[PDB]
Design a protein around this ligand. Structure first.
Ligand SMILES: *[C@@H]1O[C@H](CO)[C@@H](O[C@@H]2O[C@H](CO)[C@@H](O)[C@H](O)[C@H]2NC(C)=O)[C@H](O)[C@H]1NC(C)=O
Ligand SMILES: *[C@@H]1O[C@H](CO)[C@@H](O[C@@H]2O[C@H](CO)[C@@H](O)[C@H](O)[C@H]2NC(C)=O)[C@H](O)[C@H]1NC(C)=O
Ligand SMILES: *[C@@H]1O[C@H](CO)[C@@H](O[C@@H]2O[C@H](CO)[C@@H](O)[C@H](O)[C@H]2NC(C)=O)[C@H](O)[C@H]1NC(C)=O
Ligand SMILES: *[C@@H]1O[C@H](CO)[C@@H](O[C@@H]2O[C@H](CO)[C@@H](O)[C@H](O)[C@H]2NC(C)=O)[C@H](O)[C@H]1NC(C)=O
Ligand code: NAG
Ligand code: NAG
Ligand code: NAG
Lengths: 73, 228, 318
């Protein structure tokens, strides 16, 4: 139970092939997180959550309806 | 209108909750207040440190020693503390200019965002921007950027022009679209199709140069009038 | 070409100052908080250095990617869009950059370590593949909401009106423009290939840091009026009540020489933080939108922009 990283020697967490959004960023793309029993998992972070837009040279997509957010700054 | 009001009225509500149920929204403000205080305590604790003096009480050296002794010590205290001010000072000057640079970022949002309507994308918060409400907060300020984010999309088949008679037509404002049977010219951010008549469209040159033009008939507003 | 982050170092206060001497480190106990408020500083930097890069690049919800097939109405991005046959997909231009810019363990020998950036030059180049693939397909709207496919040349028809040229220009000239644009891209390669003086900025930051390390290191070898700049020598040769007085000067000396090094960072690091935001803006207004602010986005009316990362930096093609 030791996972050598690009960052350094990580002791006490469980490498995970899966990749989730970043949580406790460590280094070099390795973001630990707590959940599954449970233990700390350290997994290469997923920049974002993938998408691809169906482009096509005649195909436009026009929102029909909106929202109003409110945010804070 | 009705809908929007609700969306907005509702939207306000969540803020209370976003703020009530969370201490991690205000981290920024909350931080500044630390780093200052954080930096004071440090400054204070420095009083208790010897800096290589025999003791960190000034009067002790004074008490126990005869001054030509204390002279040499009390240097180190002075030398020490005096330094430890400059460290504290400088840290402020820098920090204080990290605020001065975040005032102006407020003094701007306050000006452009509040007092105006901002065109600068994602300055005033993700989405197109409608208005904003400042709210002070301690040593801080808080904007509520009411912004307008579009939602439900419908693919369509667009074409950049229309050959009418061999003239083109291009939309005067916002894309052409069709849902696959009739062509419609809509405004670009909110699907609201409209039949295509010469008032939607202006004409430029003949067809062919256009790449992707498509056929259709552009109805005349007038002709029905001239129909009689 | 904007700097964005800077190399995040971090520095042990202690062993920098005291090599392997409790006797030293004991003395160092006296000054107290210093040793631990450097690290507070140099972390405060090194933390944000990954907030900068966060804000510049990660403005995008969802990593996008181009369609498989490139039908752009004639503009040709193969230069900029990620290079699939690269191992790390850094599209062509970005690679000119990583060459045009430039030991790592040489500086990390006296506690002066260099923590790796939160993001990795591989990721950075996924984002700027998003930004650059949403810009292309989705128009700008992907900053304002759900990305919306719109056919490019029915975008550059809008990014015209934004400059007050009626669109019937575009379609009627489309072919020409494509060439002008396709050509125009080309020269960049050459501007970058044949010249080391484009990237001076980025190239500089990287110096001044390293420049400032060496200085910091060399300070180890200086006497500061001590009998010698080796700690253990004084230790060796003298009996401590002697060394006590000396090792002050070393400590006093080095300790000072940190603060100088620290402060220089804090200032410098806030010269980046002020040039991140200038990127974090261009990235927002210029890329994700179309900017009306004259000569913000480069001389001329402004059509669009393509970011390209570059090491500790970012590069726009306006
Ligand atoms: C636009 O979207 C809003 C929600 O974002 C829709 O509002 C809901 O509409 C349904 C049915 O019309 C109602 O049952 C709900 O009460 C509405 N919600 C609110 C908060 O008012 C709205 O209908 C959508 N409009 C269109 C044309 O799709
Ligand atoms: C695309 O939208 C147009 C506009 O509504 C549709 O044409 C109309 O379709 C409705 C369907 O009930 C008819 O009642 C109208 O009489 C049609 N208008 C005309 C002028 O014929 C068209 O059907 C839509 N296409 C699709 C696939 O939804
Ligand atoms: C749009 O409709 C016109 C007809 O109004 C089409 O023009 C025809 O084009 C073909 C080949 O280019 C010629 O052989 C015909 O003689 C043309 N007809 C006329 C009346 O000029 C045009 O092709 C249509 N556009 C598309 C994209 O199909
Ligand atoms: C887009 O531009 C790139 C580079 O300008 C083109 O790449 C060259 O394409 C020719 C084909 O005409 C090949 O023979 C060369 O090997 C390519 N050069 C390089 C460096 O890869 C590309 O073909 C263009 N594609 C489009 C669709 O415009
Ligand atoms: C990770 O996954 C790869 C394939 O996804 C598999 O071959 C490998 O054994 C896994 N290893 C670990 C440590 O999960
Ligand atoms: C439009 O078509 C694309 C093609 O894949 C699809 O991804 C998208 O969901 C479609 N839009 C709607 C509203 O169905
Ligand atoms: C769009 O691309 C398709 C590819 O299937 C091509 O056949 C068609 O000519 C193109 N038309 C336009 C208007 O781009």
């Amino acid at each position: 139970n030791v996972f050598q990283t690009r960052a350094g020697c990580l002791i006490g967490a469980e490498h995970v092939n899966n990749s989730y959004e970043c949580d406790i960023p460590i280094g070099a793309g390795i973001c630990a997180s707590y959940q599954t029993s449970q233990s700390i998992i350290a997994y290469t972070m997923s920049l974002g959550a993938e998408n691809s837009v169906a482009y096509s040279n005649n195909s436009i997509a026009i929102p029909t309806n909106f929202t109003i957010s409110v945010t804070t700054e | 209108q009705k809908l929007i009001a609700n969306q907005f009225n509702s939207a306000i509500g969540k803020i209370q909750d976003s703020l009530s149920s969370t201490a991690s929204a205000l981290g920024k403000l909350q931080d500044v207040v630390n780093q200052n205080a954080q930096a004071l305590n440090t400054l204070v604790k420095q009083l208790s440190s010897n800096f290589g003096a025999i003791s960190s009480v000034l009067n002790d050296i004074l008490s126990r020693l005869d001054p030509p002794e204390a002279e040499v010590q009390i240097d180190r205290l002075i030398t020490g503390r005096l330094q430890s001010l400059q460290t504290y000072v400088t840290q402020q000057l820098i920090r204080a200019a990290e605020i001065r640079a975040s005032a102006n970022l407020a003094a701007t949002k306050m000006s452009e965002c509040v007092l105006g309507q901002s065109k600068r994308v994602d300055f005033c918060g993700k989405g197109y921007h409608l208005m904003s409400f400042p709210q002070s907060a301690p040593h801080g300020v808080v904007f509520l950027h009411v912004t307008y984010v579009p939602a439900q999309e419908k693919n369509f088949t667009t074409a950049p022009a229309i050959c009418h008679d061999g003239k083109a037509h291009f939309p005067r404002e916002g894309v052409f679209v069709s849902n696959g049977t009739h062509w419609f010219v809509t405004q670009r951010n909110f699907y609201e199709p409209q039949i295509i008549t010469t008032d939607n469209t202006f004409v430029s040159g003949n067809c062919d140069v256009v790449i992707g033009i498509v056929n259709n008939t552009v109805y005349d507003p007038l002709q029905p009038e001239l129909d009689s | 070409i904007l700097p964005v982050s800077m190399t995040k170092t971090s520095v042990d206060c202690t062993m920098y100052i005291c090599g392997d001497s409790t006797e030293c480190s004991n003395l160092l106990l006296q000054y107290g908080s210093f040793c631990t408020q450097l690290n507070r500083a140099l972390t405060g930097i090194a933390v944000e250095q990954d907030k900068n890069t966060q804000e510049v690049f990660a403005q995008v919800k969802q990593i996008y990617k181009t369609p498989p097939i490139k039908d752009f109405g004639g503009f040709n991005f193969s230069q900029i869009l990620p290079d699939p046959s690269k191992p790390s997909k850094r599209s062509f231009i970005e690679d000119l950059l990583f060459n045009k810019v430039t030991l790592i363990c040489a500086q990390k020998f006296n506690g002066l370590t260099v923590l790796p950036p939160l993001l990795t030059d591989e990721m950075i180049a996924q984002y700027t593949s998003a930004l650059l693939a949403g810009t292309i397909t989705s128009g700008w709207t992907f900053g304002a909401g759900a990305a919306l496919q719109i056919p490019f040349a029915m975008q550059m028809a809008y990014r015209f009106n934004g400059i007050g040229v009626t669109q019937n220009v575009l379609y009627e000239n489309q072919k020409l423009i494509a060439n002008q644009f396709n050509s125009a891209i080309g020269k960049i390669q050459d501007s970058l290939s044949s010249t080391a003086s484009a990237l001076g900025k980025l190239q500089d930051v990287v110096n001044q840091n390293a420049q400032a390390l060496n200085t910091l290191v060399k300070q180890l070898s200086s006497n500061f009026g001590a009998i010698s700049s080796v700690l253990n020598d004084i230790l060796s040769r003298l009996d401590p009540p002697e060394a006590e007085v000396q090792i002050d000067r070393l400590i006093t000396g080095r300790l000072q020489s940190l603060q100088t090094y620290v402060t220089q960072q804090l200032i410098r690091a806030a010269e980046i933080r002020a040039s991140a935001n200038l990127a974090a803006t261009k990235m927002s207004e210029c890329v994700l939108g179309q900017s009306k602010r004259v000569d913000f986005c480069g001389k001329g009316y402004h059509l669009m922009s393509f970011p390209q990362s570059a090491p500790h930096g970012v590069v726009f093609l306006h």
